[PDB]
Amino acid sequence: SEIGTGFPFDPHYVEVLGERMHYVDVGPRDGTPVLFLHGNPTSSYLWRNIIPHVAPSHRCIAPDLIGMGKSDKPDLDYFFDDHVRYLDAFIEALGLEEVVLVIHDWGSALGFHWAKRNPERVKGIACMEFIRPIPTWDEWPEFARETFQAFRTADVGRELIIDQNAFIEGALPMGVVRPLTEVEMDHYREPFLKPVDREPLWRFPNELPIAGEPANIVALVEAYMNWLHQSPVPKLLFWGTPGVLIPPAEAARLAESLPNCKTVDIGPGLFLLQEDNPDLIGSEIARWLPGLAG
Ligand code: NA
């Protein structure tokens, strides 16, 4: 597939709530910008081979979430609400008005939550392996079930994620169909070389709305899934087999229940669909974008 391992983007940094957040910023500076939101345990690196399909026709902005990627690492609890506050302010610091969202994992919770609060400002949502309510563990795929249950068990989770760096060395390769190369692994490892900096990677999977907990995250996600269900905004939904957060049966269900939703099968896929078929994801987004103007 010739999947590029390089990250050939000029680094940019903007002051947000007294901290520096890194972001990619390429492509033309008129038109509607496309805002790329990664999740755990990733960063803007996740979008490296999708962005070139879009940059020719649209501005691409891809921030690194606070405590992740090349962004500053303040001493926060790194709950979802921390991420909401920082992204809201990133968005304001960049003077963005209307945007198109391209989102994944916790980047999708952030995006969908920002959309619900600012519906008039989002012209489209491209999403994949995104956060929805997981009412039973039974719907979490077997192969990844014990991994995440352990992440969420008291003290054992921290030892795995902070001490063994398990999210990076274990969960991450598991969530990619193809074998990641060492070069790719080293980019992903980069922000988390020091154990103490791995805090956001532990808090996040403990924020996942699974089996009713944490209750506040469940309610928030349900609220944005309800907004999404009601919203006429154009939607582009990428899915793989068997997936992780989004099983093929869930995508098919959403294909019918979500208004103005086009679904796209990337082929074999787990968690980081971007790593398995970035050419289809990129080119489909690029084809879909011009229609957003009406
Ligand atoms: Na997570």
From Swiss-Prot:
GO terms for cellular component: membrane. Keywords: Detoxification, Hydrolase. SUPFAM superfamilies: alpha/beta-Hydrolases. Pathway: Xenobiotic degradation; haloalkane degradation. The keyword Amino-acid biosynthesis does not apply. GO terms for molecular function: haloalkane dehalogenase activity. GO terms for biological process: response to toxic substance. InterPro entries: AB_hydrolase_1, AB_hydrolase_fold, AB_hydrolase_sf, Epox_hydrolase-like, Haloalkane_dehalogenase_2. The active site is at D105, E129, F271. Its EC number is 3.8.1.5. Residues 33-157 form the AB hydrolase-1 domain. Gene3D superfamilies: alpha/beta hydrolase (3.40.50.1820). Pfam families: Abhydrolase_1. Belongs to the haloalkane dehalogenase family. Type 2 subfamily. Monomer. PANTHER family: CIS-3-ALKYL-4-ALKYLOXETAN-2-ONE DECARBOXYLASE, MONOACYLGLYCEROL LIPASE. Catalyzes hydrolytic cleavage of carbon-halogen bonds in halogenated aliphatic compounds, leading to the formation of the corresponding primary alcohols, halide ions and protons. This is Haloalkane dehalogenase. It comes from Rhodococcus sp. The lineage of its organism: Bacteria, Bacillati, Actinomycetota, Actinomycetes, Mycobacteriales.
